[PDB]
Every structure is written in C-alpha cells, then in structure tokens.
Amino acid sequence: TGRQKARGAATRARQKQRASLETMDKAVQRFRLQNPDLDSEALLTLPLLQLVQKLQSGELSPEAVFFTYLGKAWEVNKGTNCVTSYLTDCETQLSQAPRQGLLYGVPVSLKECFSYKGHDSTLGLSLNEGMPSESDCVVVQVLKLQGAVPFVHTNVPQSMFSYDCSNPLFGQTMNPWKSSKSPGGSSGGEGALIGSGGSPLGLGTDIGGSIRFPSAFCGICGLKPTGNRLSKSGLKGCVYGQTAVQLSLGPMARDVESLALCLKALLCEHLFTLDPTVPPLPFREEVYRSSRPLRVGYYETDNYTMPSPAMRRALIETKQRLEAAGHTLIPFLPNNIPYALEVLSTGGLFSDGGRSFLQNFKGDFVDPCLGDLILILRLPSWFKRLLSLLLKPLFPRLAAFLNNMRPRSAEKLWKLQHEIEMYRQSVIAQWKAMNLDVLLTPMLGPALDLNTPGRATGAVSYTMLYNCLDFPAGVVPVTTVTAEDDAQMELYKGYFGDIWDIILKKAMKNSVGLPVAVQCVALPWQEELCLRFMREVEQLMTP
Template identity: 55%
Template sequence: MIQEMLTQLLPELEVDPRTVSALLCASAAAVAALNWMQRRRIQEKMEEARRMRDLGLQRMEKAVQRFKQQNPGADPSRILSLPLVELAEKLKEGSLSAESVLYTYVDKALAATRELNCVRHLIPECEEQLQDLQGQKEKGLLHGVPVSIKDHMSYKGHLSTCGFAPFLGPPEQEDSVLVQVLKRQGAIPFAITNVPQSLFNYDCSNAIFGQTLNPWDHRKSPGGSSGGEGALIAAGGSILGFGSDLGGSIRLPSSFCGLCGLKPTGKRLSLSGVTAPVPGLLSVTGTIGPMARDVDGLALCMRALLGEDLFQLDPTVPPIPFNEKLFCASTPLRIGYYETDSYFLLPPCMRRAVRETRELLQEAGHTLVPFAPPRVDYVVNELFMRGAFADGGSTLTDLFAQDLVDPGLKPQVNCYRIPSLVKKILALLVRPLFPRLAWHLDALCGVRSAKAMWQHQACVLAYRTEFIAKWKKLQLDVVLCPVLGPAFTLGYPGKLLAAVSSTMLYNTLDFPAGVVPVTTVTETDEEELLHHRGHYNDAWDRRLRKAVEGAVGLPVAVQCVALPWQEELCLRFMKEVETLACERKKCV
C-alpha cells in the first residue's frame, strides 16, 4: 500500500519507492528507539532518587537507634502527646531537650512512612542544626520544634521535584526564605513530604515515590497536593508542617486527614525559593501556610514567622507583624454562612458540619447571617480554570511528555492533551446533557491573546469587588462554609477536579481561609449519601457519591474565611469553632 502511494506521488523522481519506504521504516524505528531511551533515562533517574531516599531513611534510622541506646529511659509517648504550644514552651525553658524531641519525631516519622509512604526524604542536616541550637543564647518561638516541609519548598542540598522526573536535577543551592526564617526561629526542618505529580491534583501520588495513604483508612487518599504533610502530621510523625495552596492544597488534606490548616493571603508569607511547575501564574493566587493538630499551633507558627527576619529576607512581603490583639479579641462576631455554593453539592456530612457549627456559634452569642457566594460556576470555570490553564495546559503537558504519567493523573492529563479545537467541539456536543463538563472543557482551552489575558485579569478584579461589596453590605466579620470531604477513595481525585469549588473560590478571591475538624462521618450520613443527587444529578455528582462512600468514622471539617490580610481574625474564628466543637464532643 505504501509503495503504491509513493509510486503515485513521486512519478517525476527517479527514486525507488521501496528505498523511501525503507527510510521511513528506519526513521520510525529510530523514533521508537529514542522514545525507549528517553523512558529508560527517566526510569534510571527515578531509581536513583528512590535509592537516595532509602539511604537517607537508613541513615536517620541508625541515628535514632544510637539515641535510644544512649538514652534508654526516654519516654516518647510523653513528647508525642504534647500540643505544639506546650511542647515549644518546654523546649524553650529547657525541661525538654531538643535532641529527645527531634529523635522522637524522626522515629515516629519513619514508622509513619513505612505504613503510609508520606515522607519523600528525611533531612540528615537536622542533626547539624541540632548541634547549632545548643550554642544559641537567644531562643526563638519555635526553638527545637521539629517541622516538616512540602517537597517543593527548597532546602539546600536537596531536590524540589513537584513529583516530576524532569525536576530530578541538581539539588537546591540555598534554602527557601520560609526555611531560613524557621531556622532563625529555632525550628528544625527534618522531613520533606510527598506530593502528587505536578501538584495539580488533590490526591498524593507520583511515578517516582509512589502513593501516599490516609492514616485513618488506607483505602482513602490523604488529599493533596500537600498530602504527604497531611498524612505525616495526622499519623503523629510531625507536629508542625508546611503546605502550599493554589486550589485547596492545604485545606483539602487538612479536611481529609482531620487537621487544622491555614491558607493565608497570597503574599502574607514568602514564596521565594518555592518551586512551581507553572512559574509566573498570576491569575490564581498561590500561597504557603501551616498545618498542625490544633489552631493554637497555627497561631504560634504565624506569630513566629511574621517578624523582622521574614520582612528583611523578602522585601516583597508586606511588613505586617502578627496582630495579637485581633487574635485574642473576644467580642461576638457577625458570621455569614452557607451550606452549599450551588455549584457542587457536597456530601450530607459536610453540610451537617456547617449546620451544627452554625448552631453552636449562635448559642455562644455570635450573630449568624445567611450568605450566598455569587456565581460560583462562573468563578470555577471562567476565572479559576481558564486562569490556571491560560496556556491551554501546554506547560504541564510538556512536562508530562518528559515523564511517566502517574495512573491517578491520567484522566486529567488526557483531558489536557486534547487539542483546543477538539475541546471546543466536544463542549458544544455535550452541553445539552452535561453542561458542567462543557464549561470545564471550554475553560481548559485557556486564553487566546494578551488582550484576552488582560480582560481575564480585569474580570477577576471585578468579581472580587462584587464579592467584597456583598460581604460589606451584610456587615460580616467572617464566613463559615463547607470544605470538600470526607476523604476520597484512592483514584477518584483525578476524575473530579471541579469538585474543589469550595476551596477554589477563595484562591480566586485571595482571601485567607482555614479548615477545622468538627465531627466525624456517621452511619446516618452514610445512609443519606445513598440519596445524594447533587445540584445537577450528572456523572460528576454520581462519581462524588462513589468517591466518599464507606467513610464512617472519618474526619469532617468546616471552612473559616476572612477578608484579605486578616489571618489573625481567621485564626480567632477557627479557634472559636474548634473550642465549641471540642466542648460538644465532651458533652455527647
């Protein structure tokens, strides 16, 4: 067949079609060989990264055993049971040694990662920092506190991979600003935690280091993209960790794992030295923030970070110190609330959590006001998705082309790879039956020109103005609302990207938002889930029901939101919710 075609196409040339056919076959074979070689190089880089991780774990295992032999009477359970604020106080006054605390948490982290695969790498240099602390006269607020950091927060001498094989290059040349400030405050970064490939997913798996599991139920995801952090802290292997949040990546693992997590306003903490798979993204505001077991731990962390060290190291961060007066205020709050954003109806347990928390807040003397966020469908598709994928997803697809795609990400990646024209045609075809998928496909086409990009930015600003005007008209201090949960069954996050509308909204607005666990999934919740139809009763609603089933006993959280630069008010509100929820549990 090929020879006949070539004979017809090349009648004027004195070329044997069989020769051309042979050349084409040889070229195809060469391309196949190059592809094989590229995949082999990728696999070799992955194997080397895994080998280095294993060596690091073995080195720290030996250090822990050495400490145990030298200190046979050490009581790890006492250290692990202390809340962060109390632990920090005992370290500062000297009633606990930084050495005993560090090795206790390293030991617990080793056990946690053997079970859950949550640690990407332990940091052997933490032992050197431990020695440096002994000579310090001035003790920072986090003196001796072991902390974990997400994979892409640079630590000198270690990789920042974003879960991508193409990023398995030379190690970082210097610490990120966050790590530098932590060290100046006496904290000891000791673990780098696992992430999903690309960070654009709220599961936690990549082709290099594998799948991280939820400590509550190994069939479930820990959330993402700060999933390694969520799993490690929830398993007791870290007392304070740091994640990043572009669409919910601090709040979702906090929700899935039963933790407290804070997404600050975009520039409240420094992003200098934090690796991004899509650098220069401005339409949606990413940020870094703390994750801990309680709100007081988050407040202590922000108190330690928001000081002169941070402002000097990164002059682009507004020099706004921690507002103690705002955090400690006790005047009643005027709180807006909603149980659904009218775009993605969350499972019954998540709406129940908002309802019960609203009742507790009312009983405590706060004023609760119904609030409906405007046009969330527009925010998710036109503002968030079109902004985050302004290039049509080409930056990410170029990276995936140099890597082996993690199985959990294949549904997302396949969608990115569809040519824009085909996406638009598919959007037109499916719109009558599946409007949300049509909006999603159209948004993934991105923007077509600089002018369209400017218009998009103007739309984001206009929506923010509209939202704040509605907030101010109701004279709200804060807002109580749902967060996605409970923990999804493994494999589902990559099939339900748009389900994170509850968190995407506040990245688009660039408002501080935190998550607080308040209850757990009950048998009644599970029974009501059987009748869950969602707002659209489409394939996504049915898939959501499947994703969260079998969750009895898993954590259920709520989301607390404040206006930009009011992290202290957000934390104060979170603390009020946490206190009331804890009191309720004691009474039940």
C-alpha cells in the same frame, strides 16, 4: 520507549528515599539506646505550645524532642509513605538553633516543594530529579532563624496540580485513618504525617485547596493565607508567571494555636528583609486573641458540589453552636460561583491552554491519580471547543471546563485579569452589605478513595473559590462520619449528575469514623481574625 530517562529517575529517587529512611532509623535506634527511660508517649502527645514552652525552659532538650519525633515519623511512614527525603542537615541545625527563637527546638515537616539546600524538589516529575537545590528557600531560612528544625520533605502528587497524593517517583501516599483513602493533596504527605502524630507542625502550599484538602481529609488544622502574606521566594513550582490565581503557602498542624504560632514566627523582620516584595505586616496578636461576638456568614451548600451528609451536618452543627455562644449567624453565599470556578479560576490557571504546565510531563509517566487531566489539556484548542459545544446540552459543567482551558491572547488574559479583579470587589461589596466579620462554609469530606480526586474535579468548588478571590481560608476538624451519615451518602445525587458527581458518591463510600471539617474565611489580609474564628470553632466543636 521515551521513558528510559523517566525510569532511571524513579530508580534513583526510590533509592534516595530508601537510604534516607534507613539513615533516620539508625539515628533513632542510636538515640533510644542512650535514652531508654524517656517517656516518648508523653512527649509526642504534648500540644505544640506546651512542647515549645518546655523546650524554651530547658525541661525538654532539643535532642529528646527531635529524635522522638523522628522515630515516630519513620514509624508512621510505614503505613502512609508520606516521607520522600530526610533533611540530613538537621542534626547540626538542631544544635545551632537560635535559643530565644519562637520555634526553638521544634521539628517541622516540609512539603517537598519548599527548597532545601542539597535536596531535590522533584514534585514527582522526572525532569526535576538530580537537580538539588543550591539553597534553602526564604521561609525555611526564617524557620531556622526562629529555632525550628526542618527534618523531612513530604510527598506530593505528580506536579502538585491534584488533591490526591501520588507520583511515579516515590509512589502513593495513603490516609493514616484508612489506607484505601486519599490523604488529600497536594500537601498530602504533610496531612498524613501530622495527622498520624509524626510532626507537630508543617508547611504546605495551596492554589486550589492543597492545604485545606489534606488537613480536612486527615483530621488536622490548616491555614491558607492571602497569597502575598508569606514569601514564595525559592519555592519549587512547575508553571511560572501565572498571576491571575496566585499560590499561597501556609501552616498545617494539630490545633489552631499552632497555626497562629507558626504565622507569628514567620511574620518577622527576617522574612521581611529576606523578601522585600512581601508587605511587612506583623502578626496582630490583639486581633487573634480577641473574644468579641462575630457576625458569621454561612452556607450549607455552594449549589455546585452537593455536600456529603457528613459535610452538611458538620456545617449545621457548627452554625448552631456558634449561635449558642452569642454569635450572629447570617445566611450568605458569594454571587456567581459557577463563573468564578468555570471562567475565572479555570481560565486563570490554564490561560495558555495548559501548554506551560504540560512541558513538565514531556517524556514522563502520568500518574494514574491525575485522571485524564493531561490527556484533556493536550487536546487541540479547536477540539476542546467542538467537544464543549457537543457536551453543553447534557453536561454544561463539563462543557464549561473544556471551553475555559483553551489558549488565548495576552489581550484576553488582560480582560480575564480585570474580571478576576472586579469579581473580588463584587464579593467584598456583598460581604460589606451584610456587615460580616467572617464566613463559615462547608469543606470537602470525608476523604475520597485513592485515585478518585483526579476524577472528581468539580469538588474543588468549596476551596477554589477562595483562591480565586484570594481570601484567607483555613479548616478545622469538627466531627467524624457516623453510620447514619454514611448510609445517607447512598442517596447522594449531586446537582449535575455528570461524571464528577457520579464518582464522588462512590469515592466517599465506606467512610464511618473519618474526620470532617468546616472552612473559615475572612477578608484579604485578615489572617489573624480568620484564625481567631477557627479557634472559636475549635473550642465549640472539640472542647
């Protein structure tokens, strides 16, 4: 009752998914029958830059690469449920891919919100089912103009406002390293696909960590650029006109060099003419390729989310190896992180009390992976306030969250917007006072159990800071959880001892062997330097 439309949308969606996967399988079986002697292990394990080179030279055909990757994608989906839709168009695009394109012949996976002609971008929401996109979004257009072959849409958590990966339409995506673990989110399908070898390169989006969480959780690299570095034209969203905390799109891949290639390919005249609102900043190769010693700011904890033992070791070990390689490591923590998270970020994202966002869920199921977010956002402003005052003496983090997700006037939004602006300049001034080039931080990990990211909201602290600040931030895998890391987690307390701390301890249990990352940060518009730094970390920690 009130879910008949919702149930119909799920039924039709699951059938579209089933039919896409069947279509993929038949295409693959057909190719393999014609090409039984093809070494697919050789092809799949090629680093993207090498694959690109052999495609450009003609040593590998676009068909060989496409169908080999398609088969692997179909196979890894069995254990992960990361693919929602096969972009059927892509065999004709495969044979029309511009030949001198920088991504010529390269299969690329897309987060479901990247609009693709003839396909739904459901976001797991019933209201977006049977609403196929009338055209490719700008970044998909540019990928195609650079010779890339977008081949799949990958799963997201319902609404994308989550760092887990389940919705009522396509269901739950699972981490390929351990099926009881979350692949992270909201680009969770991308993390799981790329992380199991089913795609050499993908695109995701990030408003609170959604490129960096699935990258870290699935053992892959990811970059969230400055928000307006790449075009968001034609991206499917669910809140419109919230500009306090901007969304950013960026690459995900198996190595840092893939991120740089993808950025280089996207930052071309095609993109700049298709979307004039994006500043025409070409990829500065000389900055990316530079090898000068760096002043590297670093912290082991943000004093908000206690790092897991694995997180702290990964950070410390990276710091140490950077110092051994000639870099100057400088203790640095951005000022007033509780403010940035509780007031600026929470208030920016929910200035209207959650009302606009909540329109999406009307008549829909609420996926269990979203926790109580929808229930909480729905509370009357006065009750958010009362409950906040009652909780403040015991659980001030919870109290501050509740108080700052209440509706407000446009006058108060201006005030908040100016505070975000002044806070950005404050941290820039702090950074300049220490003469930093870059900043090295912990990254959330290892992967949390399925359906717990929605109950561990405080753990977005490490990522969300750089959305608030709108700094480029990316993640690099540096280590895996040891027996000792995992045993030490038994003693994890957290700084607050509220429900978010309590859950995280349990959610990270049984994590031996799982990948753990560090986060690399630079100033606004310094994507190339941020990537240069990520490259250094990758050279030192996975040589």
